[PDB]
Swiss-Prot record, chains A, D, E:
The chain crosses the membrane at residues 12-34. GO terms for cellular component: plasma membrane; plasma membrane light-harvesting complex. The chain holds residues 12 to 56 of 69 of the full protein. This is Light-harvesting protein B-870 beta chain. Antenna complexes are light-harvesting systems, which transfer the excitation energy to the reaction centers. Its main location: membrane. Disulfide bonds: none annotated. Coiled coil: none annotated. It is found in: Cell inner membrane.
Curated annotation (Swiss-Prot), chains G, H, I, J, K, L, M:
This is Light-harvesting protein B-870 alpha chain. It is a single-pass type II membrane protein. Belongs to the antenna complex alpha subunit family. The keyword tRNA processing does not apply. Residues 1-12 are cytoplasmic. One of its GO terms (cellular component) is plasma membrane light-harvesting complex. The chain holds residues 1 to 47 of 62 of the full protein. One of its GO terms (molecular function) is electron transporter, transferring electrons within the cyclic electron transport pathway of photosynthesis activity. The chain crosses the membrane at residues 13-33. GO terms for biological process: photosynthesis, light reaction. The core complex is formed by different alpha and beta chains, binding bacteriochlorophyll molecules, and arranged most probably in tetrameric structures disposed around the reaction center. The non-pigmented gamma chains may constitute additional components. Antenna complexes are light-harvesting systems, which transfer the excitation energy to the reaction centers.
Swiss-Prot record, chain N:
Disulfide bonds: none annotated. The lineage of its organism: Bacteria, Pseudomonadati, Pseudomonadota, Alphaproteobacteria, Rhodospirillales. Belongs to the reaction center PufL/M/PsbA/D family. Keywords: Bacteriochlorophyll, Chlorophyll, Chromophore, Electron transport, Iron, Magnesium, Membrane, Metal-binding, Photosynthesis, Reaction center, Transmembrane, Transmembrane helix, Transport. The gene is pufL. It is found in: Cellular chromatophore membrane. The chain crosses the membrane at residues 32-55, 84-112, 115-140, 170-199, 225-251. Its main location: membrane. The reaction center is a membrane-bound complex that mediates the initial photochemical event in the electron transfer process of photosynthesis. Fe cation binds at H190, H230. This is Reaction center protein L chain. Pfam families: Photo_RC (PF00124). (7R,8Z)-bacteriochlorophyll b binds at H153, H173.
Amino acid sequence: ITEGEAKEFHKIFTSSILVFFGVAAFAHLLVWIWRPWVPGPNGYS
Amino acid sequence: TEGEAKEFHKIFTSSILVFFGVAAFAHLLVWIWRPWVPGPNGYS
Amino acid sequence: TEGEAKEFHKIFTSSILVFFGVAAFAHLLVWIWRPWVPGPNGYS
Amino acid sequence: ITEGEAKEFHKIFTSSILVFFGVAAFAHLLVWIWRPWVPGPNGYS
Amino acid sequence: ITEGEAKEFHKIFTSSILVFFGVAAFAHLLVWIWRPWVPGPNGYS
Amino acid sequence: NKGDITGYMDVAQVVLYAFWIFFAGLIIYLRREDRREGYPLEDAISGKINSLQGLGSVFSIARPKIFKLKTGATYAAPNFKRDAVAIKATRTAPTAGAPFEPTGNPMTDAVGPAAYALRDELPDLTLGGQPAIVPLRVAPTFSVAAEDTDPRGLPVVDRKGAVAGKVTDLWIDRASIAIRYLEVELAATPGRKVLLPFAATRINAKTKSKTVTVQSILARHFANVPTIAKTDSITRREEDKVMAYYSSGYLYSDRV
Amino acid sequence: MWRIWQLFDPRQALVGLATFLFVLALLIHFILLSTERFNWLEGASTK
Amino acid sequence: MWRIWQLFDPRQALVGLATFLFVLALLIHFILLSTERFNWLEGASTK
Amino acid sequence: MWRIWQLFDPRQALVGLATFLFVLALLIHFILLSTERFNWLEGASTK
Amino acid sequence: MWRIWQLFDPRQALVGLATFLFVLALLIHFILLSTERFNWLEGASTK
Amino acid sequence: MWRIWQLFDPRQALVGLATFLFVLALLIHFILLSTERFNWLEGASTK
Amino acid sequence: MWRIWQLFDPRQALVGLATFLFVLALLIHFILLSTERFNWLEGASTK
Amino acid sequence: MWRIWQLFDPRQALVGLATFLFVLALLIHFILLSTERFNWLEGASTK
Amino acid sequence: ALLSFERKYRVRGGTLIGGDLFDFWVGPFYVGFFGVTTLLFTVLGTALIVWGAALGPSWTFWQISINPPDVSYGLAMAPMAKGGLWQIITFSAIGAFVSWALREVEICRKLGIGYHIPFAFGFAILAYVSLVVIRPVMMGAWGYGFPYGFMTHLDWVSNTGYQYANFHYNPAHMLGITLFFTTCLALALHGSLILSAANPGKGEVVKGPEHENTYFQDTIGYSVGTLGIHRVGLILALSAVVWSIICMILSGPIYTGSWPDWWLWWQKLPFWNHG
Amino acid sequence: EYQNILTGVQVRTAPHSAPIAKGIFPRLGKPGFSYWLGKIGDAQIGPIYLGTTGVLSLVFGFFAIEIIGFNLLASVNWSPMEFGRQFFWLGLEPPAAEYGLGFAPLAEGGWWQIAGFFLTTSILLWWVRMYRRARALKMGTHTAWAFASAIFLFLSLGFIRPLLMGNFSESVPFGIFPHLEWTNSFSLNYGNFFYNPFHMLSIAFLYGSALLFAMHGATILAVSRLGGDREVEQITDRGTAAERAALFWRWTMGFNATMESIHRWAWWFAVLCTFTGAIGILLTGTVVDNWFEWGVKHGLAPAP
Ligand code: 07D
Ligand SMILES: CCc1c(C)c2cc3nc(cc4[nH]c(c(CCC(=O)OC/C=C(\C)CC/C=C(\C)CC/C=C(\C)CCC=C(C)C)c4C)c4c5nc(cc1[nH]2)C(C)=C5C(=O)[C@@H]4C(=O)OC)C(C)=C3C(C)=O
Ligand SMILES: COC(C)(C)C\C=C/C(C)=C/C=C/C(C)=C/C=C/C(C)=C/C=C\C=C(C)\C=C\C=C(C)\C=C\C=C(C)\C=C\CC(C)(C)OC
Ligand SMILES: CCCCCCCCCCCCO[C@@H]1O[C@H](CO)[C@@H](O[C@H]2O[C@H](CO)[C@@H](O)[C@H](O)[C@H]2O)[C@H](O)[C@H]1O
Ligand SMILES: CCCCCCCCCCCCO[C@@H]1O[C@H](CO)[C@@H](O[C@H]2O[C@H](CO)[C@@H](O)[C@H](O)[C@H]2O)[C@H](O)[C@H]1O
Ligand SMILES: CCCCCCCCCCCCO[C@@H]1O[C@H](CO)[C@@H](O[C@H]2O[C@H](CO)[C@@H](O)[C@H](O)[C@H]2O)[C@H](O)[C@H]1O
Ligand SMILES: CCCCCCCCCCCCO[C@@H]1O[C@H](CO)[C@@H](O[C@H]2O[C@H](CO)[C@@H](O)[C@H](O)[C@H]2O)[C@H](O)[C@H]1O
Ligand SMILES: [Fe+3]
């Protein structure tokens, strides 16, 4: 729409991207600490 | 529909926090009752 | 409207509070009869 | 939709709810005396 | 349809393609280190 | 054994082959009925009566059945009344399969999706021998039912949003109770009035305001909509012309 | 949260809320009747 | 609490209340008839 | 986070959000009921 | 990197991205549930 | 090759690019999951 | 073949060739995956 | 308790009430017929 | 080779893809790019079907069958000799159907009419895809698709129907059957009403929309209308196909048991579960 | 982008109808209007014509329905609850083989025979009603003969095949699930009713009727912006809607119908769907004991 009313939309979009990706990686890190999803050469223990 | 929505957003976020608080309290109680993350041996 | 909303919410909160209190009493009676949260060995 | 007839309706409506709930509670007391519907720990005897 | 707009978009498209291909190549390298997908003459040891 | 007729042939097979013969005859009959409009076929370029057709030609075209009208009129089907070979377009290639380049503004030249059948200049009739498509002014009894947005006075806009005009009147079919046309007064020419088919409108009752939008033609295209004579009763040819013009929008709404 | 009543008229709001509440309560009562233990009509032994 | 009657006309409100209550009464009576303990017609013993 | 609502109608946003939350809550509750461990009605043993 | 939003529809982008990400998350969760190792409800032993 | 987009429409090209990449990624991931070797959710071991 | 693009639309030709090449490559890849020898995911033994 | 008829027109009210009463009476008679104790047509010893 | 009114709408344009390259007619047919692609897929699929007939033992048109791969192959591509030919014919059929629908879209644009017809054909394409792609993928093997054979795909229908021990008890199947039968009844009524209005007898001037409305107002008590009847008929056919697709997704991917005893839920509702 | 799938704006006027001779009975039903029906089609309801044949058909049909319902309720010992439980499984079963085509005892299939006779009489009287209503409005009787095809299938299922077998034992019961079970057991008893070729023809015509009434519905809805919904008027005076409807199918298919002849196709597919079905029902058991063995003999099966 407007010329400059997208830079602030970009600001809020990148803020949302950081908020979502941080908690996503946080959840993935807890999942890996609990149970990793890459089996070793002889499988899982 | 440009300034009157500020109060809608503010009480929207108020409802956000209060609903998430009661949901987190519910989850804490359920965890105390029975956790939903298996251990290395499972559920003993 | 705007004037009717004041007292409409004023008695909506009271009505929902009464309904919730009756529900809480009913749940407390049912829990006294038979709790719905099992134990580590299930339902005694 | 004048409110005077609304109030006149509401008063007898409340009276009707009261008598309905009273007769229903009397019926429920009679049925409970006949056979209770809340089993004990051992169930129904 | 502005030509300068297309010329500017070329830079961001190239940066996006480079970062995406780099992510994909790093992912493929990690997978290859974990488990190679090209079998040996005797199958998979 | 029980159901056989001759050794290998049995009753069920015979009835099946009887059905196959009957179905072949029925297909012939149905194709004869199909070939009641636009037949016989013409050459793609010259227009002479020619087509790759076999011994079924004698059976291909049926004798003209006669339709009686409740006015003394009569229709013949097939009536071998054909269109002129020379249309307002030129062959892209002279190969009899090539399409046509329009040689003008195809909206107002009735070429392609703007083309309209060359009907007769009589309005549709009701059970009482009166025009069926009429404006609501000259049908006092008919009214727009409630619970629906009344499309009178609503701005008439195109897809681009430009307000093409304003609706003043609704034209309805008496035989089938439904709105057919909206009468639109041009914002650019008060002395001009046009008819916009109701099938080409969106109700748009759910927005900031109530308006009527058209997705086919643009606002300026409302300056060349075909006109009608009586302004209170419209012939079949006039309505077919207007609908064809409006339907031509989607193909080339932005020049040619 | 009083301002919520300008978005929704109480006419449709109350009928929708009442029908939803009744459906939810009826479904919960069916679930309790059907399981094994909170069925207050069959009344089986707990142990 | 009387303010209900300028949104819900008593004609429709009372006919809906009557239909709902009658259906609920039929439901409860039938559910009781399906249970042995409370089927007052078959009259199975308490024990 | 100040100007989101200019693009979405708050009424339909609330309606859709409430529908989604109720449906997802039912889905999670019924999934837990289908589980042995988290079925609080046809309850089972932790051990 | 700001002209993308004046290229695309901000409302359509949010709606489509939200529903697409939700469907993806739901699929991943259901796949994990279908997995013997990562099903956090059945809780079978890692060994 | 900086003159590909001089006539190629950008929005449709990028929408189709994202859709094609996502569909191909789903296909390759599911194919890997179907394999007895690269299925990272069970880990059937190599030797 | 000097100017063959004075006869064929470069956009349509490029899109058609991209689609044809993708479809053919997908077909060949799936055919190889169907085999016992060139299935690089199953990884059978040449000997 | 006489002011009801200002709203409910006696014509349709009586027809609906009569139909409902007949349906209820028929339902009760059928239920009684089904039961082995109150079937007055088949006849069965009480003792 | 043209109708009396044909050499008036044979304008160019209205093509999604191809520009002016394939915007022409061959005989009565319009070709377009998607006509070329539907020829491409149809020729290849039919040639593969005839090739599978050659590999088969019959040449009896009703005993010619292309079988899908055994379920032991799962969702894997199969060797062409044993299962793969069915898969390629399936892909060619899907491509030909999509090309057909898209060519219909181009014809609709060229004639400036609505796109209702290709949209309605999309439902038949979806039913076929659900039968050969969606359901086999959910069930986990290409061997749950039906064989490409005259009488053998009926053997597939019967075998899968009796796999759930009575497939009539599939409630979505009941609803699809109801919609199909109602579509046939509505089509009979509509064709009959139009023919009777157009052909009323000796003398008997052609009747108008009011006569058609009056006929079903007198006989049934309601008349849909000369426009609404085509609406309800298209919706009836599309809904019959939708509910058939639903009943086939429900069987196998979702429900893997006897349909007749699915209905015991009805037998045991709390207000008549006499026990 | 409008589609003529729903009517956003409706019109309501003074109800009117085509003139009929007064006759013994008048038009009945005090016509009213409905909103959803007007959204999908016309909004007016009624009035319904109730002539002497209408009264006769309604009385016979009501007698049959009351007999059937009374028997269904009596089969569960008049229990409304258990009637609700077993309603789908309830059925009025035809008389056994030993009774032939004569009257069975009421409990042993006499009620089934009486109900079937009354239902057949009401259906035939309804056919006469359709014929007379079409003739009264100075119209053709195409609907009557299309209905006669369905009546042929119905009578073949219920009466004609019992006549040929001399036995009502294998007729179809009056029940929801029982008549489906009759269908299943009829197919099983006579060897994979798929191998009945007239069953194949009937399925072909049912599929073709659905296909045709989707094609035609979508075509008329696609040319409804051009006056294409007004089919009879395009039949008497060919407009551009009919021309484009024909040219679409001519370009996509190679051939085309007329606005008039497409409904001839529609009529015949529907009629044949039940005509071939009645023939296939009349052929099983009487001529062909096992349709699978007939298919094996005639090359439909690989001859195990
Ligand atoms: C295990 C079962 C077995 C299995 C193999 C299988 C499978 C399939 N089949 Mg079949 N079918 C089997 C058995 C079997 N099959 C049929 C029939 C058909 C025809 C019906 C056409 C119709 O409209 O009927 C329906 C029309 C009728 C019955 C005639 C008109 C009815 C009228 C006027 C009734 C008027 C009613 C009132 C006024 C209301 C008051 C009355 C009361 C309350 C009582 C149709 C084509 C059809 C379709 C398919 C498909 C698509 C399949 C698939 C996908 O597998 N089947 C009938 C027939 O014609 O057979 C030749 C028949 O009798 C019979 C038998 C025994
Ligand atoms: C081409 C083949 C096609 C196939 C696929 C197909 C199938 C099936 N078509 C089926 C039913 C009917 N079809 C019909 C009619 C007959 C009504 C009747 O007999 O009434 C006569 C019966 C009865 C009177 C008995 C009950 C009565 C009741 C329930 C009311 C009782 C209460 C009363 C009287 C008191 C209260 C009311 C007052 C006013 C006081 C019914 C609705 C008709 C036609 N099918 C055609 C064709 C097809 N039918 C054509 C062209 C038709 C007509 O012309 C005619 C009609 O009226 O159509 C509108 C079924 C169950 C089918 C399936 C799938 O099994
Ligand atoms: C108005 O109703 C109230 C009371 C609410 C409820 C009443 C009734 C109810 C609930 C009825 C429900 C009925 C149901 C569920 C019916 C289901 C019917 C079905 C599916 C029927 C399907 C097929 C049956 C057929 C096709 C039967 C055909 C039988 C025929 C044609 C038999 C004809 C027999 C004759 C002519 C017999 C001749 C022999 C003799 C010599 C006896 O003839 C005089
Ligand atoms: C938000 C998106 C989330 C992105 C998630 C990215 C996941 C990437 C994780 C894998 C990184 C590589 O991690 C590496 O894998 C090898 C594979 O043998 C593992 O190797 C080790 O673990 C395996 C399995 O327990 C054992 O047999 C052994 O102790 C050792 O070989 C280690 O775990 C780690 O050295
Ligand atoms: C996005 C870009 C993607 C790029 C993907 C590139 C894939 C191609 C990588 C080729 C690497 C080849 O590497 C070569 O392969 C041979 C098999 O022939 C492997 O062979 C070796 O490992 C295999 C493992 O099964 C053993 O069984 C074998 O005995 C041993 O010689 C070695 O690892 C290496 O010698
Ligand atoms: C828009 C998205 C479109 C794509 C969506 C796809 C959803 C479903 C994708 C499933 C892909 C399955 O892909 C195919 O799976 C089968 C499953 O037997 C594998 O089959 C292979 O492994 C299995 C074991 O897992 C063996 O039993 C089988 O003998 C072997 O051939 C194939 O190697 C693989 O090519
Ligand atoms: C006998 C076994 C059971 C079968 C039932 C036999 C009796 C019922 C069918 C008898 C034949 C009915 O045949 C039909 O009868 C009615 C009168 O009843 C006449 O029709 C009459 O009623 C119609 C109703 O629309 C009116 O227009 C008018 O009053 C008159 O024409 C028809 O002209 C005749 O065709
Ligand atoms: Fe039609």
